[PDB]
Enzyme design. Structure first.
Site, PDB file in Angstrom:
ATOM      1  N   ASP A  35       0.843  -1.196   0.000  1.00 19.18           N
ATOM      2  CA  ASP A  35       0.000   0.000   0.000  1.00 19.18           C
ATOM      3  C   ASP A  35       0.879   1.247   0.000  1.00 19.18           C
ATOM      4  OD1 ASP A  35      -1.908   1.895   0.312  1.00 19.18           O
ATOM      5  OD2 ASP A  35      -2.427   1.383   2.397  1.00 19.18           O
ATOM      6  N   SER A 199      -0.530  15.571 -12.057  1.00 20.90           N
ATOM      7  CA  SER A 199      -0.755  15.202 -13.438  1.00 20.90           C
ATOM      8  C   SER A 199      -1.004  16.455 -14.262  1.00 20.90           C
ATOM      9  CB  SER A 199      -1.955  14.249 -13.514  1.00 20.90           C
ATOM     10  OG  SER A 199      -2.343  13.995 -14.854  1.00 20.90           O
TER      11      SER A 199
END
Length: 330
Positions: A35, A199
């Site tokens: 994770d 992004s």
């Protein structure tokens, strides 16, 4: 040193991925959920409330000659999906894919919430976010990667998750045969303890690319792709009959649909998520309403590049003094 381990989807939907991890002496192999959105290595154990164990493999520290109680240390964690677990702490030897850390904090669960009990395939979590998020008190503990870093050939790990197929976590090296083209690296902020990056935009299907900054986290422990409501609405508007369902808890679409791809930007590069990766199947057995793999982050407080996005790429988690993320197509 290096390590290399195969990671395998837990079910036919890729709801999560499990990777075998050796703990203790003699080794006890548990299948952990790696994770990158948390920083605790915790396991089902001989200390876990018996009624909360349902098929998981447990770590038994009393059977490990290298286990030592970390006296006074406790841990307690709550995850974004509302699940939780807590317990005490041992140190022990932990190996992943041939890479060994001695003295790793292994957090033994005394209690786990129902979603963990109900998932018999996941024996615990191995956190790979920054150690500043580790919940051990009163002495915070380091992640497996942080402990291994100095010994690694290069201070990196890579996630190569498969679509409906096994993939690989590598530590200490970049497998140049595992991706196509070049790796595009992008800046990371560690201010929230995550692999947080920006992004450069998105496209839906064959549509034009929209240049827009989307801050979010690379999180192997989240199944889906959570993005701003504007972006998610633009995606689902291209699917006839798709709608956001408050009763189901997100966007659903007719199972008869063919889904468009979704592209996200990494610098000047582009990662394309095929439409099929966004199909999470019937909302309930036999339903013709299917659950979408791109959902709004509006209720979370952060955008999450979960498995749906990451499995479309070869992803480098660069833990150099200034961390960065790398993405390549594959």
């Amino acid at each position: 040193s290096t390590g290399s381990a195969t990671t395998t989807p837990i079910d036919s939907l890729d709801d999560a991925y499990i990777t075998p991890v050796q703990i203790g002496t003699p080794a006890q192999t548990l299948n952990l959920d790696f994770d990158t959105g948390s920083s605790d290595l915790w396991v089902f154990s001989s200390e876990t409330t018996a009624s909360e164990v349902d098929g998981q493999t447990i770590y038994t520290p009393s059977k490990s000659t290298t286990a030592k109680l970390l006296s006074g240390a406790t841990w307690s964690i709550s995850y974004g999906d509302g699940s939780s677990s807590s317990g005490d702490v041992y140190t022990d030897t932990v190996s992943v894919g041939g890479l060994t850390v001695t003295g790793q904090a292994v957090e033994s669960a005394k209690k786990v919430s129902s979603s963990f009990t109900e998932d018999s395939t996941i024996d615990g979590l191995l956190g790979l976010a920054f150690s500043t998020l580790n919940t051990v008190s009163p002495t915070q503990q380091k992640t497996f990667f942080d402990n291994a870093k100095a010994s690694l050939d290069s201070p990196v790990f890579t996630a190569d998750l498969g679509y409906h197929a096994p993939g690989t976590y590598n530590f200490g090296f970049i497998d140049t045969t595992a991706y196509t083209g070049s790796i595009t690296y992008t800046a990371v902020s560690t201010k929230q303890g995550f692999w947080e990056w920006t992004s450069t935009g998105y496209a839906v299907g064959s549509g034009t690319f929209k240049s827009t900054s989307i801050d979010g986290i690379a999180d192997t422990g989240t199944t889906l792709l959570y993005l701003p409501a504007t972006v998610v609405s633009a995606y689902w508007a291209q699917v006839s009959g798709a709608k956001s369902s408050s009763s189901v808890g997100g966007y659903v679409f007719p199972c008869s649909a063919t889904l468009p791809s979704f592209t996200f930007g990494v610098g000047s590069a582009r990662i394309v998520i095929p439409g099929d990766y966004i199909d999470f199947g019937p909302i309930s057995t036999g339903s013709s309403s299917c659950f979408g793999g791109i959902q709004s982050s509006a209720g979370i407080g952060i955008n999450i590049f979960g498995d749906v996005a990451l499995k479309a790429a070869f992803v480098v988690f660069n833990g150099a003094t200034t961390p960065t993320l790398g993405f390549a197509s594959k």
